[PDB]
Design a binder for this molecule. Structure first.
Ligand code: HNI
Ligand code: HNI
Ligand code: HNI
Ligand code: HNI
Lengths: 146, 141, 141, 146
């Protein structure tokens, strides 16, 4: 991922201010809310109809805990991102069969929730150096597709 | 198909902006500028610098026109028809580029409107924007 | 907005296919499969191998349903409504993915229909496909 | 650009069968025909209204002669494509101001005309190893954008 030694002390130091547990699971519950084409994979998650029922699903709030775990687990692996999500890309490919674009819808929400939690903290020159981390964490995760 | 769930939703969501449309448009551009770098190719005469009375002036434009779509949401296609044209005959903005700001005009609301920007308003603010950015290109071929 | 320029255009363009809808569908899938590798994730039970009675059988499906849209193009939204539903309640195919075949279903026409696939039919065959792939997701939110 | 030592003797040896002059200019005239959002840049080209009048303004058939010149000029520069179109990317950027996506619309048409000229010659396993050269000749040409 193409990233500056400047704006990273701005894309990585605000993240420690995040909550991989509720935020991470907030992003994915919000994913099935707005962009509901990603619900085909979480069928067996009970009920995700109502928006209070998608943002309050236990398995939905528990999947978004670990889906950021790795995202969090590679926010300091910014120079081999394609390699760190690797094993994690050739799986969404054959087992779950997760379309590589889905990884992009969720990468945008995660920046639309981050600005939600952070408000004005989120400066214009700062969303810019995160979009790059998401529109790039997606690649890495779609790179293992044959 | 937009339900009145989203129509009244945003009527209250976007409603909270009002006098903020000047800043919340002005700065929703600079986000699109600094993140995606294929959206300032359309603004060559402009300035992609902080506080440029171009964008900052432009913020009262794409936003102040969004007010009337929300208002005339009951009939957008005839709400700002001169606008749906003064693109594809004057200046065309390229379909996929509308998205590159159909998703940054959420952030100025997702940050500047926390308590209001809820998981359902997200879907009601997107749906509105997922149409405003299609009502304009209604005449692209 | 589709003019009768494209409507009668494709009525004559796509018209030349007819009995070829079985092959020209069957093989318009395998192009989408071999080029873009994020479209066979939807066909896990299928086969992404040459001449698999799955795709080959499926070719009489996405194509044979395209016949009726061209025919009932006068009113597509009510031309195959059970189809516009069957995606976003049964199997959703994801909007951007429709494009990944909204542009490979041109090639089986661009090759298998040279003399017919003209620079204007290109625009009349796209516009038809640029709507058939939007009439289905008319119920996606 | 990611390319196999197999399918290249299939993405490069059929090209010598092409006509950078009429084909190259056929692709771009066809571009302003179907996808007419690219016409903002060729205003000063007389009249490109009618489709018989776009497949011919004669500047349109002369621009598509050299726009393939380079495309042709880098179909054997497949391992430094990003570098060969380089100077040619930072120009479409602040002189013409050519949106990087435009380079993608045209990259698809060029494969929709190639099938046109070639018919059955164009096998499924062969469009695949060309899309990659176009969905990749676009990147290189959009990479120089600040
Ligand atoms: C819209 C769907 C979707 C998106 C955007 C998405 C985006 C991501 C991203 C974002 C770039 C990352 C790092 C990621 C990581 C993972 N996903 Ni995703 N996943 C998605 C749908 C899934 C599904 C479905 C599973 C299987 C879940 C389960 O528990 O059955 C999955 C499983 C995983 C696993 C678990 C491995 C295992 O089960 O062996 C990891 C790790 N993921 N997913
Ligand atoms: C990046 C492409 C792009 C997109 C997606 C876009 C999306 C929108 C949307 C979508 C929700 C709306 C309501 C909107 C409204 C407007 N745009 Ni947009 N515009 C875009 C590129 C422009 C450009 C370029 C101009 C001209 C600026 C100038 O000063 O010349 C513009 C000018 C305007 C004007 C100015 C009126 C005038 O000067 O006469 C309005 C109003 N708009 N634009
Ligand atoms: C790659 C994603 C994808 C796209 C872009 C797509 C685009 C289209 C288009 C667009 C021009 C049309 C007219 C179309 C028509 C159909 N598709 Ni699609 N389909 C897609 C993935 C599917 C899948 C998956 C199925 C189910 C196959 C099966 O056998 O379960 C499917 C099934 C169908 C059926 C079968 C009816 C039934 O079994 O009851 C029709 C008709 N379609 N699909
Ligand atoms: C929709 C617009 C558009 C597209 C898709 C496009 C796609 C391409 C592609 C496709 C992948 C290639 C290889 C290419 C190559 C070139 N383009 Ni493009 N160009 C385009 C709009 C231009 C414009 C505008 C110019 C300046 C033209 C002129 O003559 O003023 C241009 C000029 C050039 C030049 C001339 C160099 C110079 O003037 O010094 C080359 C070479 N190009 N262009």
């Amino acid at each position: 991922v193409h990233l500056t030694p400047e704006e990273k002390s701005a894309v990585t130091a605000l993240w420690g201010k995040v909550n991989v547990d509720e935020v991470g699971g907030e992003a994915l519950g919000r994913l099935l809310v707005v962009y509901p084409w990603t619900q085909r994979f979480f069928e067996s998650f009970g009920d995700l109809s109502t928006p209070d029922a998608v943002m309050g699903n236990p398995k939905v709030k528990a999947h978004g805990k670990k889906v950021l775990g790795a995202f969090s687990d590679g926010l300091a692996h910014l120079d081999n991102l394609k390699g760190t999500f690797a094993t994690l890309s050739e799986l969404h490919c054959d087992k779950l069969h997760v379309d590589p674009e889905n990884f992009r819808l969720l990468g945008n929400v995660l920046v639309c929730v981050l600005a939600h939690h952070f408000g004005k903290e989120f400066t214009p020159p700062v969303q810019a150096a995160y979009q790059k981390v998401v529109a790039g964490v997606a690649n890495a995760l779609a790179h293992k597709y044959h | 198909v937009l339900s009145p769930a989203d129509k009244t939703n945003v009527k209250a969501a976007w409603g909270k902006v009002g006098a903020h449309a000047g800043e919340y448009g002005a700065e929703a551009l600079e986000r699109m500028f600094l993140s995606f770098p294929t959206t300032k190719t359309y603004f060559p005469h402009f300035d992609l610098s902080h506080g440029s009375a171009q964008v900052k002036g432009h913020g009262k434009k794409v936003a102040d026109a969004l007010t009337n779509a929300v208002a005339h949401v009951d009939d957008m296609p005839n709400a700002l028809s001169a606008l749906s044209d003064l693109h594809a005959h004057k200046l065309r903005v390229d379909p996929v580029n509308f998205k590159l700001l159909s998703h940054c005009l959420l952030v100025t609301l997702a940050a500047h409107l926390p308590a209001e920007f809820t998981p359902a308003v997200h879907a009601s603010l997107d749906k509105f924007l997922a149409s405003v950015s299609t009502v304009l290109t209604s005449k692209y071929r």
